[PDB]
């Protein structure tokens, strides 16, 4: 039971659009809570820009109604950002880069009560040993969620999400054959990923209180 | 809103 030709076409489309980076020059800037926050918001803005570009290329996305396209993008932005962060946390980066990124996020006005779950979730993801295909598919599945608020046509979204889940199930069998619970483990992490919507909203209101200002794109997608 | 619609189109 390998991938069918239409599944191979679907997977390649997802892969090509996913591999089109958030980290420019983190290093060129000084370390202090103010600069760490600005770097953080600059990387989150870059991530939203690449998310919109990936989303508009998902097969069938352009066929959906304009309002449902916006509901899917706003509803997924925070989860997709935590998933991408978990991918980067587990990415083999040069000697120091991960440590600088990690140190910047710990000194950016975020309470350690959010940092603890965040990094626990990130460590939990790395133990799964996901391939670039698993991260690309999981992102597409997160974006094409039929249970987001303000979707007028939910069956249309489910029709797009369904083939992606079928592909992910098959990849788990191919790439993780000794762990038959791997697919169920990935969907368990999606459930854990949804808890960050609440945590993010809390971090946002703490930043607002300390008069932090966000970039125009983050203001629109996060409703700040 | 407008910025998201601009980026989507
Ligand atoms: O934990 C985050 C992100 C946290 C965050 C961002 C915005 C926000 F409102 C609350 C939390 N990391 C990240 O690199 N974030 C960047 C921006 C987003 C897109 C990915 C890059 C890790 C830090 C540790 C090294 C691996 C990465």
| Name given to the CATH architecture of chain A | Orthogonal Bundle
Beginning-to-end CA distance, first to last residue of chain A: 47 Å
Oligomer: heterodimer
Supply the helix-strand structural class of chain B. mainly alpha
Number of strands of chain A: 0
Shape of chain B: elongated
Sketch the topology of chain B as an H/E string, one letter per element: H
**Highest CATH level, the class of chain A:** Mainly Alpha
Give me the Rg of chain B, rounded. Answer: 5 Å
User: What class, by secondary structure content of chain A?
Assistant: mainly alpha
Strand composition percent of chain B: under 5%
Let me know the CATH homologous superfamily of chain A: Retinoid X Receptor
Might you state the CATH topology name of chain A?
Retinoid X Receptor
Order of helices and strands of chain A: HHHHHHHHHH
Domain NR LBD (chain A): 6-224
Cross-link (Glycyl lysine isopeptide (Lys-Gly) (interchain with G-Cter in SUMO1)) (chain A): 28
Binding site for chenodeoxycholate (chain A): 84, 114, 122, 200
Modified residues (Phosphothreonine) (chain A): 195
What do you see in this structure?
The complex is a heterodimer of chains A (224) and B (9). Chain A is mainly alpha-helical. Chain A has one domain: Retinoid X Receptor (Orthogonal Bundle). Chain B is mainly alpha-helical. Bound molecules: ligand 9NM. Ligand 9NM binds next to α2, α3, α4 and α9 of chain A. The ligand O=C(/C=C/c1ccc(F)cc1)N(C(=O)NC1CCCCC1)C1CCCCC1 binds next to α2, α3, α4 and α9 of chain A. It is classed as transcription. Keywords: D3R, FXR, Docking, transcription. The assembly is dimeric.
Q: In short, what is this structure?
A:
Chain A is mostly helical and 224 residues long. In chain A, 69% of the residues lie in helices and 0% in strands. With 9 residues, chain B is mainly α.
Describe the structure using short key phrases.
heterodimer; A: 224 residues; mainly alpha; Retinoid X Receptor; 10 helices; B: 9 residues; 1 helix; elongated; binds ligand 9NM; transcription
């Amino acid at each position: 039971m390998e991938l069918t030709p239409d599944q191979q076409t679907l997977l390649h489309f997802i892969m090509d659009s996913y591999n089109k980076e958030i980290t420019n020059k983190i290093l060129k800037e000084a370390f202090s809570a103010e600069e760490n926050f600005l770097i953080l918001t600059e990387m989150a803005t870059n991530h939203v820009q690449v998310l919109v570009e990936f989303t508009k290329k998902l097969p069938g996305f352009q066929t959906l109604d304009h309002e449902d396209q916006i509901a899917l993008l706003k509803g997924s932005a925070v989860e997709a950002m935590f998933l991408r962060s978990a991918e980067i946390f587990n990415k083999k980066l040069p000697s120091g880069h991960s440590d600088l990124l990690e140190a910047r996020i710990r000194n950016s006005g975020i309470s350690d009560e959010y940092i603890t779950p965040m990094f626990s979730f990130y460590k939990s993801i790395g133990e799964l040993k996901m391939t670039q295909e698993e991260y690309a598919l999981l992102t597409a599945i997160v974006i094409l969620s039929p249970d987001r608020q303000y979707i007028k046509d939910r069956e249309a979204v489910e029709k797009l999400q369904e083939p992606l889940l079928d592909v992910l199930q098959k990849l788990c069998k191919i790439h993780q054959p000794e762990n038959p619970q791997h697919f169920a483990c990935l969907l368990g992490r999606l459930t854990e990923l949804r808890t960050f919507n609440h945590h993010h909203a809390e971090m946002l209101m703490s930043w607002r209180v300390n008069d932090h200002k966000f970039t125009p794109l983050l203001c629109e997608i996060w409703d700040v | 809103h407008q910025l998201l619609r601009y980026l989507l189109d």
